Amino acid sequence: PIFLNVLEAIEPGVVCAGHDNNQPDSFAALLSSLNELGERQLVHVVKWAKALPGFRNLHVDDQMAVIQYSWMGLMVFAMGWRSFTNVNSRMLYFAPDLVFNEYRMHKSRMYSQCVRMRHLSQEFGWLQITPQEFLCMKALLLFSIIPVDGLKNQKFFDELRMNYIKELDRIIACKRKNPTSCSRRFYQLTKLLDSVQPIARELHQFTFDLLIKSHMVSVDFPEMMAEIISVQVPKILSGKVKPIYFH
Ligand SMILES: C[C@](O)(COc1ccc(C#N)cc1)C(=O)Nc1ccc(C#N)c(C(F)(F)F)c1
Known part of the structure; x- marks a missing residue:
């Protein structure tokens, strides 16, 4: 299981937000912690x-854009996966020190x-x-949103994306003899992956509008994030950059 060995090997560890949970919840604090x-x-x-199999094959400019x-x-x-495994979806597990109950969901103004x-x-x-389906689906997610005008090396991108789909196929076929069974599974997973995109879009729209009025709501936007929201996010919102849906 060479491929899966790698994904498990590079899977990021626990990341904390640095949020002050002894402080009464406030929109400003929650958002600053979400940005951080x-x-x-x-x-x-x-x-x-950058440690993903075949990622270096992509053109330098395409690697950054895609990320x-x-x-x-x-x-x-x-x-979502963390929320499921940690709290059985009872709350949103952004980080161990940033767990959202409905009250926080509401105060964040990102309730929907x-x-x-x-x-x-x-x-x-x-x-x-399964933990393995999750890891492959996540890697696949990285190669599911491109510019309409194409990447610098679109062909290397297409190959890579195709290879990741094949890996998902293999993980599905593993311990499944009936193709019909593999088919329904592939149907479910691709349907789940698509569902992630509309969510990111709402977050993109929300974050963008917030940046534009950040000086009103007292939100400190990190330098890196600010640049990306103003340079990259608008391309997605204006339709120049779009996700690849299966369905
Ligand atoms: C409000 C904001 O701070 C905005 O952050 C971004 C992140 C990426 C882009 C882009 N491109 C723009 C803003 C935010 O959504 N942060 C933020 C931080 C952590 C996590 C996790 N896990 C998530 C979420 F929504 F769950 F993906 C969101």
């Missing part, structure tokens, strides 16, 4: 992504998005997603 946590996780998504576009969705998918992520979290359970 997001920036902390990106550091790991970068090290993780930046997939950033939100990758965090959403992993957060959070409810969609709790549902995602429940999906991991209902579909009985």
Whole structure:
């Protein structure tokens, strides 16, 4: 299981937000912690992504762009899985020091998005997603959103994406003799992966509007995140950069 060995080997560890939980909840504090946590996780998504089999095959410029576009969705998918395994979807497990109950979901002003992520979290359970399916689906997620005008080396991207789909096939075929069984499973998983995109979009829209009025709500936007929200996120929102849906 060479491929799976690698994914398990590079899977990021626990990342904390640095949030002050002895402090009464406030929109400003929660969001500053969400921004900090997001920036902390990106550091790991970068090290993780660059260690992915075949990732270096991509053109330099395409590697960064792909990470930046997939950033939100990758965090959403992993957060849902954490919420499922840690608290059985009872709450959103952004980080051990940043757990959201409905009250926090409401005070964050991202309640609708959070409810969609709790549902995602429940999906991991209902579909009985295995730890290995999760790891392959996550890696696959990284290669599921590109520019309409294409990447610098679109062909190397296509091959890579195809190879990751094949890996998912293999993990599904493993311990499944009936193709019909493999087919339904592939159907379920690709359906789950697609569902992540609309979620990231709402978060993208939400974060973008917040940045634009950040000086009003007293939100301190990290330098790196600010740049990406103003340079990359608008491409996704304006339709220049779109996710690849299966269905
Ligand atoms: C509000 C914001 O701080 C915005 O952060 C970003 C992250 C990526 C982009 C992009 N591209 C833009 C803003 C945020 O959503 N942070 C944030 C931080 C951590 C996690 C986890 N796990 C998540 C989520 F939604 F679960 F994916 C979101």
